[PDB]
């Protein structure tokens, strides 16, 4: 006979905490970008980005992060 | 025989605190883009972004997460 | 006979407290940038990426993080 | 005779620039405040003020003065 | 004869620049106050404060100033 008991128990805290969050600034691409192009030959696919892309601000109050995995196999 | 019990117990808190939250500047792409072409030649697929594309401010005021997975396999 | 008891018990913390978190100043690319380009000849795929891109300014106010994996495997 | 010319010429700036301006806290009198009195003879004028009175904030995004005085005396 | 010619010029400048101003914490009187008074005799005026009085947050952007006093006197 087999007998399993899976019983994890979990009182746990993943806490923050701040008085004040502020006064961020982002600036990415203040200069001055120039792209000359004179006689190019692509013979297959381009890809191109100018100027200011994919640029991020990211402020959470908190931005915590709990991951938990439970895993039972039996063979 | 076999007898399995799976009772994961969770009283998991995941919290915050913020008093204030604010005062975010994000400018991007302030700066000139010229972009200038002659004479080009082509033969596949062409993906061009120019200017300021994609920027993201992202301010959440908690931005708190929890991921669980369970699994129970029997074979 | 097998008989398997997990109990594993976790009354953990992970905390932290911040009396103010600000003045944040990212300002990436204030140069200028200048690309000049004359008989360029390419035979396969190009990728090109000309300015300020992918620059990220993250400011969590907790940003803790609890990762917890647990496996049980009968065979 | 007499010749009196008050010309003054004025071509000043005062100037101010803030990029932001914030997360600014005032918590006066968090603490208890506890007044036993017991027995007291008062043969004059009483003023009495107790607990959280006359607290400022005061948060001008300019906050800039120009005080200018002319006076011509003649006798 | 008598001739005065007043003519002051002032092309001045007063001036400040500032990226970002913030993230301020006043917090007076966070202890307690505890006041026990038994038998006092007061002949003549009194004044009693007790607590967290005439506190000041001040934060201007700016804050600059300019005082300029111009006095002729002919006699």
């Given at each position: 006979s087999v007998q399993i008991?899976?019983?994890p128990?979990?009182?746990?805290?993943?806490?923050?905490?701040?008085?004040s969050l502020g006064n961020i600034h982002?600036?990415?691409?203040g200069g001055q970008v120039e792209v000359k192009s004179?006689?190019?030959?692509f013979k297959?696919?381009?890809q191109?980005?100018?100027g200011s892309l994919d640029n991020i601000t990211?402020?959470?109050?908190?931005?915590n992060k709990k991951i938990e995995t439970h895993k039972l196999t039996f063979r």
């Open positions: 008991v899976y019983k128990v979990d009182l746990s805290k993943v806490t923050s905490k701040c008085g982002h600036k990415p691409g004179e006689k190019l030959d297959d696919r381009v191109s980005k100018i990211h402020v959470p109050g908190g931005g």
